[PDB]
UniProtKB/Swiss-Prot annotation, chain A:
The chain holds residues 184 to 366 of 548 of the full protein. Signal peptide: none annotated. The gene is groEL. This is Chaperonin GroEL. Together with its co-chaperonin GroES, plays an essential role in assisting protein folding. The GroEL-GroES system forms a nano-cage that allows encapsulation of the non-native substrate proteins and provides a physical environment optimized to promote and accelerate protein folding, probably by preventing aggregation and by entropically destabilizing folding intermediates. Also plays a role in coupling between replication of the F plasmid and cell division of the cell. Forms a cylinder of 14 subunits composed of two heptameric rings stacked back-to-back. Interacts with the co-chaperonin GroES. Can form asymmetrical complexes, composed of one GroEL and one GroES, and symmetrical complexes, formed between one GroEL and two GroES oligomers. The asymmetrical complex is the functional unit. It was suggested that the symmetric heterooligomer may represent a transient intermediate in the chaperonin protein folding cycle.
Curated annotation (Swiss-Prot), chains B, C, D, E:
GO terms for biological process: chaperone cofactor-dependent protein refolding; protein folding; response to heat; virion assembly. Transmembrane segments: none annotated. This is Co-chaperonin GroES. Heptamer of 7 subunits arranged in a ring. Interacts with the chaperonin GroEL. Can form asymmetrical complexes, composed of one GroEL and one GroES, and symmetrical complexes, formed between one GroEL and two GroES oligomers. The asymmetrical complex is the functional unit. It was suggested that the symmetric heterooligomer may represent a transient intermediate in the chaperonin protein folding cycle. Another study shows that the symmetric heterooligomers are substantially populated only in the presence of proteins that cannot be folded by the chaperonin. Belongs to the GroES chaperonin family. The keyword Cytoplasm applies. NCBIfam families: PRK00364.1-1, PRK00364.1-2, PRK00364.2-2. It comes from Escherichia coli (strain K12). Together with the chaperonin GroEL, plays an essential role in assisting protein folding. The GroEL-GroES system forms a nano-cage that allows encapsulation of the non-native substrate proteins and provides a physical environment optimized to promote and accelerate protein folding, probably by preventing aggregation and by entropically destabilizing folding intermediates. GroES binds to the apical surface of the GroEL ring, thereby capping the opening of the GroEL channel. Regulates the ATPase activity of GroEL. (Microbial infection) Essential for the assembly of several bacteriophages. Disulfide bonds: none annotated. The modification N6-succinyllysine is found at K33. Gene3D superfamilies: GroES chaperonin. The gene is groES.
Length: 183, 96, 96, 96, 96
């Protein structure tokens, strides 16, 4: 039979970087309620650059979702260990897309969630990132396949402005693949 | 019992910090080996060119910041890890 | 509290200059680590061959130009970054 | 103001020769960094093994031939480039 | 018989621990060469710059923690392996 599968908001195809982030085992998925979102343009392998952010998140008490180029090694292991220990309900995933599109999708997620993307080109550093810098969303569901953010706490005027910018990019575009990715 | 010779010191390294300042558990490279350790024994003193032995400024039972390197040597006493290093290698003794 | 040993000095490095002389914000390598830092503690003094301790020319609470190298050692006191280095490593103390 | 420590010297390097002896303008590697610089400050003096400080033979306000190397350190004072180096690094002081 | 010269010491290395603390037999790299050895002979003493010989702090018949390196030299006396090393190489003498 013909089936229809509709997904709202962001559902970019990136799953949990570590299977042990699963909060709900019977569903095999991470479920975060009202979590912060830390959007990092760089790839991270050490916990030092993020330690202030994790400490602030633990002080706040709410969960945290990391959207990054790659979290691996010491940083990933420390995040996972903290996940069991329960100090911070932290889940990490790869940023979506590839070069020159990963940044755009990260910025759209930032606009949706009312956050800011941490990058070296922009100038800010992760050691100086704050809770206000971190984004906010009402719910988050990660699985091995896809990451979904539900009701990102972001300005509607900003979301429409970003949508209009992407529309202008679609108009400027002359490639079917480029315009369908923009859409 | 082990007590050192000349300008040297026996130091039991302090346990690595399991958690960070804000309560974040540190693992692997994050929980780096501590550079601070208590002094278990103190040597008689360094020998100067004239042949006299000067007592060391390090005392027994005080915490000391020490530098890991070629000078420091790892040893086991009563199945406990200790380090042996010259008083020059000892950066500073911690007070309070 | 931490106070150093022998000819050595505890120095808290000054914050890197965020902006240039003309007001241009410096980032990354442009905002290089400052070679100037305030002296938090001063050692008893260097030990000469004869066994006498000479007080150091560095005083507590003065800014000093110091050279980063193998001699300088990074440490954390009350969760604050400090450096430990011999008085020879200290280039000069800043006045006025 | 900055004044050096021990056997060391603050030297403001002279400007590189724009033109050659015959009037040919030198550019790039031709206009090499000058090894001669005026002395802005002089240290208290080198410390001998016995603990006494010997005044340096370099005086303030005299031009000195100095060798660039690992010993010399570049610094900025009032947004002006200066060098810091031991009196041994200073080859000679220029007179007349 | 062999007795050393100057600041040096003859040390017969102790046999490597066949078993661990809990009774586990250690083989190959696990049964590493012991850094502790008994002192068979002691030198006359190190020579200072002034020409006087200072007796060494190491005595005959005491166990000493020694560092294997370029200084230590392997030798055979009455078909028994011994080591020759300066008193500086000897980390510490074991008591009790």
């Amino acid at each position: 039979q013909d089936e229809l599968d509709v997904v709202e908001g962001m559902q970019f195809d990136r799953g949990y970087l570590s299977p042990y982030f699963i909060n709900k085992p019977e569903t095999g998925a991470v479920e975060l309620e009202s979590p912060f979102i830390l959007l990092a343009d760089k790839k991270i392998s050490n916990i030092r650059e993020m330690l202030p952010v994790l400490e602030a998140v633990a002080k706040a008490g709410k969960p945290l979702l990391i959207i990054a180029e790659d979290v691996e090694g010491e940083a990933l292991a420390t995040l996972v260990v903290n996940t069991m220990r329960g100090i911070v309900k932290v889940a990490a995933v790869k940023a979506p897309g590839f070069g020159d599109r990963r940044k755009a999708m990260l910025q759209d997620i930032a606009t949706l969630t009312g956050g800011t993307v941490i990058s070296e080109e922009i100038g800010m550093e992760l050691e100086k990132a704050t809770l206000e810098d971190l984004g906010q969303a009402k719910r988050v569901v990660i699985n091995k396949d896809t990451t979904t953010i539900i009701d990102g706490v972001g300005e509607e005027a900003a979301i429409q402005g970003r949508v209009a910018q992407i529309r202008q990019q679609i108009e400027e575009a002359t490639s079917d693949y480029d315009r369908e990715k923009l859409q | 019992n082990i007590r050192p010779l000349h300008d040297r010191v026996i130091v039991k390294r302090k346990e690595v910090e399991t958690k960070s300042a804000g309560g974040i558990v540190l693992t692997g490279s994050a929980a780096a080996k501590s550079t601070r350790g208590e002094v278990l024994a103190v040597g008689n003193g360094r020998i100067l060119e004239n042949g006299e032995v000067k007592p060391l400024d390090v005392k027994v039972g005080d915490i000391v910041i020490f530098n890991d390197g070629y000078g420091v040597k790892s040893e086991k006493i009563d199945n406990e890890e200790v380090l042996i290093m010259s008083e020059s290698d000892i950066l500073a003794i911690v007070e309070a």
